[PDB]
Amino acid sequence: GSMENFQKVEKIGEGTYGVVYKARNKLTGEVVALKKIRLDTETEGVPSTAIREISLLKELNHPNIVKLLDVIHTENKLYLVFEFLHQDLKKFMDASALTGIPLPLIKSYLFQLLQGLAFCHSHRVLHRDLKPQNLLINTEGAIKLADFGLARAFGVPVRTYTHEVVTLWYRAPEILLGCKYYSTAVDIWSLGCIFAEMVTRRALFPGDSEIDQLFRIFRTLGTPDEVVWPGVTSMPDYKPSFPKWARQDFSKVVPPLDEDGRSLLSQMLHYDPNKRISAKAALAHPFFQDVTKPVPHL
């Protein structure tokens, strides 16, 4: 019926939510990404994740945020129609593993990602799942935030939100420490990790567990204390038995980076969320003085 104009081309993956296909509109020729979402029609109804993703994507209209084109209702399925993007940042990093992503392209991508994130934050939306698998690129040099399944509309000031958020490797220390409140800072942390990853060609903090993740951050950035992070020792999961590692010099953390890049990166990875740089202020950082839009080689 309502999907009669779509020809499935191929499956491009899944999620807990359901299946993602590449399809074409038989009448117009437009190629799309279709997300199929099962409705729990005898049990739970429409899932909370889809409700949030749809309502939030309908508000967010920006060049660096994936376009929701349509929402097709059946009695048993919901189809999200999205613009089709060539690939994700994860697969692009794998394709680039031997050469590395050139620094102009890294700069360009980070710039765009910050523009998309500033737009979210200005519209009271937290993404809460930034990771390379969720960032989609096209063949012209654009990159876009995607999978708003874990996103949420926040209040000013925030209240306590869902604790189980952000994939482990990209998860902010305040979350790991079990802090009562978290805010847009957690998305910036994620982005910082992704920036370092683009640069060194490996995850910055590939923890195997919650405590391991935390210790990987401490071993790199130094164990935080009251002087760098007022209030740290008062957090629900802070432990006085934490080993106290000294901070390592950033030119070892990200060898290829200039002074400016290092300056940006350290501000994105600052411990205290209230001092961690905002996306908007990061847009003004000297690192971005000379940004261009190169075309990737796909």
């Binding site: 409705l39 029609t41 005898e42 049990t43 739970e44 109804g45 429409v46 899932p47 909370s48 409700i51 949030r52 749809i54 309502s55 939030l56 309908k58 508000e59 929402v71 209702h73 934050h121 200005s122 519209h123 009271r124 509309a153 209040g155 000013v156 000031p157 209240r159 306590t160 939100y161 869902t162 805010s183 847009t184 905002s278 908007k280």
Partner: protein, 257 residues
Amino acid sequence: PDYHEDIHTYLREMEVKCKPKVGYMKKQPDITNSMRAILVDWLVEVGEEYKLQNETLHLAVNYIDRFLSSMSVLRGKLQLVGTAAMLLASKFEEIYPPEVAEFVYITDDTYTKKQVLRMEHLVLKVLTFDLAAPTVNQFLTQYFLHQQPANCKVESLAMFLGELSLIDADPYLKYLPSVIAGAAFHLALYTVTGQSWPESLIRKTGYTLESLKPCLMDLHQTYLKAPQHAQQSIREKYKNSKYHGVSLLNPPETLNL
């Protein structure tokens, strides 16, 4: 104030687009303002029983008023609309929304589980999935940061007044959440501390006592008359220590505007 100004400006734009039709109840052949008051009052109780956020209650009421702005509903189905709206608000806003079965239970088996789930879907279609509506609560919360000093009685009293506005479509439908918040805040501030709508909030909102006065006059009357209102669940809820017993406070007799 990280993104505070952009967000405030954006919600000011959205409260206009997510606003219900002011006339709507006159266009409903079978339901009235008095039936809607009963429903909202029942929703208050459900929020208490399941310990839902106040934000969830305010969202649910917005979804119901928008739905009824476009769909004719028979009175026997009005509670079904409200059950589905509250379920959707919970799914949107709560960390741990109650399960569908709890929403079936709370309607005294008037409706079936299939009815609730089908209604959920219809509500979503009618609202076209536009669930992130600004509420009186979202503005109050920001207005609270301009307190000199912070005062927990003022906050709860403000929330109580804002909540009372939910009950009476006439006259509160006429006013934007930002304005109802301004009135509630000022009225709370004055009752508790004899003080006035902050200068810093005139700057932020662009509203003055002069512009808030119409809403204020209505709100003050609502407040003085609250003990006699057929709907009492909001007064009861606001008796508890959680809310510093604010519904027990004496309303001021005059405003001296």
